Write a protein that binds this ligand. Structure first.
Ligand code: GDP
Ligand code: MN
Ligand code: MN
Ligand code: MN
Length: 620
């Protein structure tokens, strides 16, 4: 016991019991309760009633609105400063700096931000003492991946924001059963605070609590802890998504020998009755969600969805590379999602969905740019800035990074094996980014080493996901630039090593580019549902059909290899053109980038592929 009673927080528990919590679980709660000083402690159980009283509270507090037009849908407008995933204030703390990033040969590193325990201890004590003063601390027990699944991991998130608690219920498997499964096992320690203790010294915008000045998202892989402060928007507050399942998981996978990757997983079936699973890694806002729920334009072809952001993969006993979706919902970009682009999306977000920073229509509906849908006469739109918006203004009605949060189970084309703990065998890996010119529509890798190189050499123009602005093409190897959990050189090594495992069935590797333009500035490829035609060519190359043409960068489709029926007017000349003048400069940037950023931790095989390609391009 104790001498007085300053350490027994039982009297503050409004739901739950610290006596029912596992040993090292209760210590984690009480320790931080002492440090953050919350007014109440709410031990979540994930029940439908709990989710009810949670929404009502947020509504009576002025945080979220009800979209009367649809079944149980809610809007939320955030502070205009807390609108995206802050990549500049995301740090990983390890003892030695090399464990996190390779030491640059010259300038600063682009593959992560490292911070010492000394620097972090000072910044921590300047943020968390008393940050939950007057708020409720929610104890979220959640599971990444199916319960009882092998590659499944359990985490405890503490937060003072009911906006996180509700999202986590959509995005993860959160409740009481997750507590009884953990028992005395190991768990990830997640801590989150909006940084607005009461009384409010800073007036809030749109009733959105957040402290932008002090925002910090820190990772301590050595301690299995994630500590986020100030922000409360998606990737910053859903600690089980980017912080856990990608950064922390990547280090665990390296240690244990599996893979945690920023990739979608889709299964595709052909008219003959054969079905194959593919995985695609694209940067943020570049095509993953639209592709994972694609409505294909080719007859007799079916595409089911397993996940659209994170994949955990590992070689099974038979040498098959199996993958699972550790997430439980979809956290996609709203703008551009219309009945014509992503029709499967429209069928899912119509219920139990939490929209954030999208526009509201006066009849209780949602509206965003590119929705391609006429509104009824007399229907008025309120933008995400909570202002009466007309199409005559320049301000877009919905924020570019505005999101929807819908459960995966509601998807009409949900794969009947996405909850399967055994996973799905992966027979192909797809890379690509937003390349406005130069890169052909699709090509195939020449070997496992070349393929790993293709992903190391990914580049794309700056989209609207982090804080990058302008039409600048930057490097994003494996679409994982903002999510590397350890040294990128050893990351590359970890991938090349999969070729050494016994009886391994390595998948093919492809690179696509939907975003090529002409001299005028027009997309040479329709895309979206028409991308099914490039999936048909990949399905055949996996079966081993001779429809490829060797080129200085990889196998490209033969003449008359693509099912282009229904178009014909498409310019194949410029869509597959491979200019020497372009690739001679591309390798020059890829060379300078790898020599400077990866420096001494660059495996030799990747440099061998760089040389091999540099040569084949000069021989033209
Ligand atoms: N031109 C073209 N644009 C696309 C295609 N797929 C998606 N987009 C655009 O890319 C944006 C983001 O797509 P999304 O799938 O949400 O990217 P994600 O961040 O990987 O999930 C959308 O607003 C679309 O307008 C495509 O095949 N072609
Ligand atoms: Mn997505
Ligand atoms: Mn993502
Ligand atoms: Mn090797």
């Amino acid at each position: 016991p104790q001498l007085h009673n300053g350490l027994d927080f039982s009297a503050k528990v409004i739901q739950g019991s610290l006596d029912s919590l596992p040993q090292e679980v209760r210590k984690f709660v009480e320790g931080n309760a002492q440090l953050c000083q919350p007014e109440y402690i709410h031990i979540c159980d994930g029940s439908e009633e709990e989710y009810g009283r949670l929404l009502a509270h947020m509504q009576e507090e002025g945080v979220i609105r009800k979209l009367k037009k649809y079944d149980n849908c809610w809007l939320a407008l955030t502070d205009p400063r807390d609108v995206a995933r802050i990549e500049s204030k995301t740090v990983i703390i390890t003892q030695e700096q090399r464990d996190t990033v390779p030491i640059p040969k010259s300038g600063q590193s682009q593959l992560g931000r490292w911070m010492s325990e000394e620097d972090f201890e000072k910044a921590f004590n300047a943020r968390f003492p008393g940050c939950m003063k007057g708020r409720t601390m929610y104890v979220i027990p959640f599971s990444m991946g199916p319960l009882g699944s092998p590659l499944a991991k359990i985490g405890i998130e503490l937060t003072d924001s009911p906006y996180v608690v509700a999202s986590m219920r959509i995005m993860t498997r959160m409740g009481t059963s997750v507590l009884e499964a953990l028992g005395d096992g190991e768990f990830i320690k997640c801590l989150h605070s909006v940084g607005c203790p009461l009384p409010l010294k800073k007036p809030l915008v749109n009733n959105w609590a957040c402290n932008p000045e002090l925002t910090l998202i820190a990772h301590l892989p050595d301690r299995r802890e994630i500590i986020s402060f100030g922000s409360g928007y998606g990737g910053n507050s859903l600690l089980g998504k980017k912080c856990f399942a990608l950064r922390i998981a990547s280090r665990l996978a390296k240690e244990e020998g599996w893979l945690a990757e920023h990739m979608l997983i889709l299964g595709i079936t052909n008219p003959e009755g054969k079905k194959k699973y593919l995985a695609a890694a694209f940067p943020s806002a570049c095509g993953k969600t639209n592709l994972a729920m694609m409505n294909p334009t080719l007859p007799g072809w079916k595409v089911e969805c397993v996940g659209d952001d994170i994949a955990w993969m590992k070689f099974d006993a038979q040498g098959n590379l199996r993958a699972i979706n550790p997430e439980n919902g979809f956290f996609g970009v709203a703008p551009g999602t219309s009945v014509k682009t992503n029709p499967n999306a429209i069928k899912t977000i119509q219920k139990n969905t939490i929209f954030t920073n999208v526009a509201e229509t006066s009849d209780g509906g949602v509206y965003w740019e590119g929705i391609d849908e006429p509104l009824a006469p007399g229907v008025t739109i309120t933008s995400w800035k909570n202002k009466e918006w007309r199409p005559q203004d320049e301000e877009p009605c919905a924020h570019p990074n505005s999101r929807f949060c819908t459960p995966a189970s509601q998807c009409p084309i949900i794969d009947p094996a996405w909850e399967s703990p055994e996973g799905v065998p992966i027979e192909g890996i797809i890379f690509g980014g937003r390349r406005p010119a130069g890169v052909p529509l699709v090509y195939e890798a020449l070997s496992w080493q070349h393929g790993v190189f293709v992903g190391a050499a990914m580049r794309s123009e700056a989209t609207a996901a982090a804080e990058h602005k302008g039409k600048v093409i930057m490097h994003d190897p494996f679409a994982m630039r903002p999510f590397f959990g350890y040294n990128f050189g050893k990351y590359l090594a970890h991938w090349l090593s999969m070729a050494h495992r016994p009886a391994a069935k390595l998948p093919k590797i492809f690179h696509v580019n939907w975003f090529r333009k002409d001299k005028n500035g027009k997309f040479l490829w329709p895309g979206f549902g028409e991308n099914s035609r490039v999936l048909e060519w990949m399905f055949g190359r996996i079966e081993g059909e001779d429809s490829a043409k060797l080129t200085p960068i990889g196998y490209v489709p033969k003449e008359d290899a693509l099912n282009l029926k229904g178009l014909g007017d498409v310019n194949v000349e410029e869509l597959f053109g491979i200019s020497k003048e372009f690739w001679e400069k591309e390798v020059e940037e890829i060379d300078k980038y790898l020599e400077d950023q990866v420096n001494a931790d660059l495996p030799y095989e990747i440099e061998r592929e760089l040389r091999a390609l540099k040569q084949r391009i000069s021989q033209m």
